[PDB]
Design an enzyme around this catalytic site. Sequence first.
Site, PDB file in Angstrom:
ATOM      1  N   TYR A   1      43.145  28.945  14.762  1.00 40.74           N
ATOM      2  CA  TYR A   1      43.872  29.006  13.502  1.00 40.74           C
ATOM      3  C   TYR A   1      43.045  29.756  12.474  1.00 40.74           C
ATOM      4  O   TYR A   1      41.882  29.430  12.262  1.00 40.74           O
ATOM      5  CB  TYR A   1      44.159  27.595  13.006  1.00 40.74           C
TER       6      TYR A   1
ATOM      7  N   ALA B   1      46.503  23.981   2.024  1.00 38.57           N
ATOM      8  CA  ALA B   1      45.584  23.582   0.963  1.00 38.57           C
ATOM      9  C   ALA B   1      45.033  24.793   0.240  1.00 38.57           C
ATOM     10  O   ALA B   1      44.912  25.875   0.807  1.00 38.57           O
ATOM     11  CB  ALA B   1      44.427  22.768   1.536  1.00 38.57           C
TER      12      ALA B   1
ATOM     13  N   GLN C   1      38.230  32.969   7.811  1.00 45.47           N
ATOM     14  CA  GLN C   1      38.245  33.648   6.525  1.00 45.47           C
ATOM     15  C   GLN C   1      37.940  35.133   6.653  1.00 45.47           C
ATOM     16  O   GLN C   1      37.030  35.549   7.376  1.00 45.47           O
ATOM     17  CB  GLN C   1      37.174  33.058   5.585  1.00 45.47           C
TER      18      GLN C   1
ATOM     19  N   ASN D   1      43.639  18.551  -3.491  1.00 44.57           N
ATOM     20  CA  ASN D   1      43.452  18.690  -2.048  1.00 44.57           C
ATOM     21  C   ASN D   1      42.925  17.393  -1.438  1.00 44.57           C
ATOM     22  O   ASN D   1      41.742  17.072  -1.550  1.00 44.57           O
ATOM     23  CB  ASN D   1      42.489  19.835  -1.739  1.00 44.57           C
TER      24      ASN D   1
ATOM     25  N   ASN E   1      43.189  32.689   8.822  1.00 48.43           N
ATOM     26  CA  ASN E   1      43.862  33.542   7.846  1.00 48.43           C
ATOM     27  C   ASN E   1      43.825  35.020   8.199  1.00 48.43           C
ATOM     28  O   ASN E   1      44.767  35.746   7.887  1.00 48.43           O
ATOM     29  CB  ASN E   1      43.235  33.330   6.459  1.00 48.43           C
TER      30      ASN E   1
ATOM     31  N   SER F   1      48.299  27.310   2.836  1.00 52.71           N
ATOM     32  CA  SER F   1      48.811  27.802   4.128  1.00 52.71           C
ATOM     33  C   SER F   1      50.296  27.525   4.452  1.00 52.71           C
ATOM     34  O   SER F   1      50.795  28.027   5.456  1.00 52.71           O
ATOM     35  CB  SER F   1      47.934  27.290   5.266  1.00 52.71           C
TER      36      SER F   1
HETATM   37  P1  AMP Z   1      45.395  26.912   4.972  1.00 47.62           P
HETATM   38  O1  AMP Z   1      45.805  25.968   3.853  1.00 47.62           O
HETATM   39  O2  AMP Z   1      44.877  26.199   6.210  1.00 47.62           O
HETATM   40  O3  AMP Z   1      44.157  27.824   4.543  1.00 47.62           O
HETATM   41  C1  AMP Z   1      44.222  28.696   3.430  1.00 47.62           C
HETATM   42  C2  AMP Z   1      43.265  28.259   2.348  1.00 47.62           C
HETATM   43  O4  AMP Z   1      41.897  28.511   2.760  1.00 47.62           O
HETATM   44  C3  AMP Z   1      41.130  28.951   1.664  1.00 47.62           C
HETATM   45  N1  AMP Z   1      40.708  30.332   1.961  1.00 47.62           N
HETATM   46  C4  AMP Z   1      41.227  31.400   2.606  1.00 47.62           C
HETATM   47  N2  AMP Z   1      40.286  32.375   2.548  1.00 47.62           N
HETATM   48  C5  AMP Z   1      39.207  31.881   1.868  1.00 47.62           C
HETATM   49  C6  AMP Z   1      37.992  32.442   1.527  1.00 47.62           C
HETATM   50  N3  AMP Z   1      37.543  33.756   1.816  1.00 47.62           N
HETATM   51  N4  AMP Z   1      37.060  31.750   0.854  1.00 47.62           N
HETATM   52  C7  AMP Z   1      37.320  30.451   0.496  1.00 47.62           C
HETATM   53  N5  AMP Z   1      38.521  29.875   0.822  1.00 47.62           N
HETATM   54  C8  AMP Z   1      39.457  30.597   1.510  1.00 47.62           C
HETATM   55  C9  AMP Z   1      42.008  28.858   0.415  1.00 47.62           C
HETATM   56  O5  AMP Z   1      41.828  27.573  -0.176  1.00 47.62           O
HETATM   57  C10 AMP Z   1      43.402  28.980   1.023  1.00 47.62           C
HETATM   58  O6  AMP Z   1      44.433  28.427   0.224  1.00 47.62           O
END
Ligand code: AMP
EC number: 3.5.2.6
Length: 348
Positions: free
Chosen positions: A147, A305, A117, A330, A149, A61
């Site tokens: 917060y 992360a 997500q 992480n 994505n 992020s």
């Molecule tokens: P920031 O570091 O707070 O968040 C982004 C990280 O979240 C995880 N991420 C985004 N979207 C997904 C999905 N669909 N599934 C699993 N993890 C997700 C990644 O680790 C990003 O780097």
Amino acid sequence: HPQQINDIVHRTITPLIEQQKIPGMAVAVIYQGKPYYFTWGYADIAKKQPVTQQTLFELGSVSKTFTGVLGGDAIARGEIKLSDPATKYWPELTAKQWNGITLLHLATYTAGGLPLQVPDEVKSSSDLLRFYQNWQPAWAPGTQRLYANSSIGLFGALAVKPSGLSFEQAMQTRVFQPLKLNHTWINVPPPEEKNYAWGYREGKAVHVSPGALDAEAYGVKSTIEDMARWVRSNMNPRDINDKTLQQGIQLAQSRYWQTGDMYQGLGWEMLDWPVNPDSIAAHPVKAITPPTPAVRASWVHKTGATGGFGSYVAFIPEKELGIVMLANKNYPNPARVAAAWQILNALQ
Ligand SMILES: *P(=O)(O)OC[C@H]1O[C@@H](n2cnc3c(N)ncnc32)[C@H](O)[C@@H]1O
């Protein structure tokens, strides 16, 4: 290196690595404008390849800061306004719950509960449209920060539409290249792959998987040198000879909303300096009108992360002081912030 920088970094980062069992780490301390680099451990455990100053780490992020700045640059160009409806830039998004949702809301997680997500099966443009068309807000726009994505991710994709470029092309040409971030990548080119650290999750080697709006929300990889340069650029934007980019960097540190002790910028988050080290779910927001022009006496920061990486950036513009911490594990955010605060507090 100034001895006091070595002393505080060794004192602080050495135990952190030991107790978090971090396999590899790079740190930059920015002190009186200049960067000082430190590296530890391995980028690739199996191959015993040391972390170097050219090692690429996944920023997670921390990518959101690049997206926020790129958006700021588009505002500066007159290509978008944050007050514009999101639909202005995606007319196919016809569902009525989108009335009243602006680019500001997307950029600052205040659209009303967009999910953390994007659903994992969303891949194509049509999938993405259907996802947003079916989404139902939990709150009215501009009232609660969650917060997420899927929020700033969409902001980045829409912000670049007037440019005629893809998000990656816009980012490369309008942000990475002007700032000489020549080893910073949304997609790591094959010839550069040898410097890409593996991430480690439960001892297993991992890299972030492709996902919708990944470039915008979490997909950037970079070196400790480029990230030091990024921090320096955001600390003193008036030192950049590129007008709209300088303006964009400033707009990303404008204070658009307040939630408790923190203020939401574009990607960047800010608190008043000096901060209480202990002060660093959805929460209500209050609009700041006009948004406060970037406050130089701020703790400006962002955590990030991926499955295999933990990143942190923080800086205090008034004091020419900053830090970047990149690791291929992480590990908990409070540990990152505590180490960063200890180091900067000792050097102020
Ligand atoms: P920031 O570091 O707070 O968040 C982004 C990280 O979240 C995880 N991420 C985004 N979207 C997904 C999905 N669909 N599934 C699993 N993890 C997700 C990644 O680790 C990003 O780097």
